[PDB]
Amino acid sequence: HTLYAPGGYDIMGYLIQIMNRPNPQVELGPVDTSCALILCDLKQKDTPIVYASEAFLYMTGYSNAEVLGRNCRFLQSPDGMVKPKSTRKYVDSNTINTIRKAIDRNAEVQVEVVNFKKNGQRFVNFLTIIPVRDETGEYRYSMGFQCE
Amino acid sequence: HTLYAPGGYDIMGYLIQIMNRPNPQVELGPVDTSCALILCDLKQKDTPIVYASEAFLYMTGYSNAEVLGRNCRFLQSPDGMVKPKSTRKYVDSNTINTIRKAIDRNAEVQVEVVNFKKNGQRFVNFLTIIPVRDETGEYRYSMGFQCE
Numbered sequence: 001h002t003l004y005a006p007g008g009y010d011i012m013g014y015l016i017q018i019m020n021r022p023n024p025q026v027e028l029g030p031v032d033t034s035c036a037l038i039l040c041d042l043k044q045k046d047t048p049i050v051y052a053s054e055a056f057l058y059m060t061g062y063s064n065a066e067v068l069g070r071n072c073r074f075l076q077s078p079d080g081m082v083k084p085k086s087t088r089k090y091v092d093s094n095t096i097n098t099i100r101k102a103i104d105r106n107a108e109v110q111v112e113v114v115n116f117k118k119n120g121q122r123f124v125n126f127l128t129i130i131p132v133r134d135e136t137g138e139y140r141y142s143m144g145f146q147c148e
Numbered sequence: 149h150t151l152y153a154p155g156g157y158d159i160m161g162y163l164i165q166i167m168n169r170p171n172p173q174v175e176l177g178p179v180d181t182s183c184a185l186i187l188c189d190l191k192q193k194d195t196p197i198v199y200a201s202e203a204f205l206y207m208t209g210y211s212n213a214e215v216l217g218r219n220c221r222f223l224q225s226p227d228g229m230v231k232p233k234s235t236r237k238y239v240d241s242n243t244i245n246t247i248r249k250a251i252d253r254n255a256e257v258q259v260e261v262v263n264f265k266k267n268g269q270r271f272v273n274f275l276t277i278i279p280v281r282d283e284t285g286e287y288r289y290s291m292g293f294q295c296e
């Protein structure tokens with residue numbers, strides 16, 4: 001059965017994997033459940049978000065139906081309109097390249113980035129993205145760790 | 149919360165210890181952030197709840213103040229009144245028997261029990277209880293996974 005994971009993903013399992021991941025690159029610190037986190041599909045074009053907890057939804061002001069299927073970059077514009085390769089007027093291009101390259105290289109990244117909520121409120125997001133290997137060792141997803 | 153998840157018992161740590169238990173008696177399956185969690189200390193009088201995740205609070209409609217320091221059986225009555233060794237007038241007593249026995253033998257139990265929310269709403273609770281063994285063999289904590 002899958003009664004304890006209606007979201008569709010064993011988030012507890014990927015967090016455990018990260019906790020014990022060999023040679024931890026960035027310092028994650030304490031994550032439990034109430035943490036604002038999301039999971040993206042690396043095996044799907046533009047790494048769409050395939051799971052958004054809560055906390056994350058509450059924080060960003062977005063619903064589960066508003067974020068699932070989209071790339072987390074929409075949080076970079078006060079109107080949630082962020083196209084790939086484009087130039088953000090309020091977010092450091094440098095920062096996002098660090099995130100971009102780390103992701104393509106399956107490398108860990110931890111930065112501070114300017115994000116925006118649905119209503120348009122700006123805020124600093126202490127983000128960290130750690131790739132996740134599936135049952136077979138291949139990196140199929142990436143877990144997102146957001147914090148205001 | 150501030151960073152990602154500090155204030156509290158090492159819940160993440162027990163979830164890890166639990167998934168890696170090489171004696172699976174019951175099947176937990178995948179677990180996400182929607183899973184209501186509670187940690188109980190079997191060595192304290194009447195196995196009181198020492199930790200309750202927000203999902204549990206949200207599910208049972210009670211607050212942290214209201215569930216902390218108490219035995220989860222309070223959920224077996226629409227008014228929160230459930231004294232030990234007493235006959236409940238709604239619940240299936242076999243489910244209540246099975247649970248208690250399991251808990252006394254430090255055995256994993258998985259049932260569907262009849263619970264009640266703060267507002268009186270009745271719900272079927274897919275309850276799974278797994279005790280955590282100590283590095284010394286002793287069982288102090290027991291983790292409960294509940295989902296309507």
Ligand SMILES: *[C@@]12=NC3=[C]C([C])=C([C])[C]=C3N([C][C]([O])[C]([O])[C]([O])[C]OP([O])(=O)OP([O])(=O)O[C][C]3O[C](N4[C]=NC5=C4N=[C]N=C5[N])[C]([O])[C]3[O])C1=NC(=O)[N]C2=O
Pocket residue numbers: 038039040047071072073075076083084085086087088093094096097099100103113114115125127129142143144145146
């Ligand atoms: C979000 N959380 C979250 C969670 C998870 C699980 C993942 C995988 C990622 C996030 N992110 C990041 C977001 O999804 C995305 O990865 C990020 O926006 C960067 O990637 P992308 O594809 O948007 O990059 P793009 O469009 O190329 O823009 C970069 C920027 O840099 C300039 N650029 C381009 N080539 C360059 C250059 N500068 C210098 N040198 C070269 N060679 C461009 O002009 C662009 O402006 C999350 N994002 C978020 O904001 N918040 C989270 O919580």
Ligand SMILES: *[C@@]12=NC3=[C]C([C])=C([C])[C]=C3N([C][C]([O])[C]([O])[C]([O])[C]OP([O])(=O)OP([O])(=O)O[C][C]3O[C](N4[C]=NC5=C4N=[C]N=C5[N])[C]([O])[C]3[O])C1=NC(=O)[N]C2=O
Pocket residue numbers: 186187188195219220221222223224231232233234235236241242244245247248251261262263273275277290291292293294
């Ligand atoms: C709750 N979650 C949760 C989480 C965690 C971590 C634990 C450890 C436990 C739970 N539970 C269970 C609850 O706290 C409690 O353990 C459970 O209700 C059983 O224990 P208890 O103390 O209530 O038993 P009691 O009072 O002895 O009553 C048994 C009952 O059965 C009948 N009986 C008694 N002797 C019998 C007999 N029938 C037949 N033969 C004999 N010899 C009587 O009718 C008794 O009244 C959680 N509980 C919950 O409801 N929801 C959760 O999510």
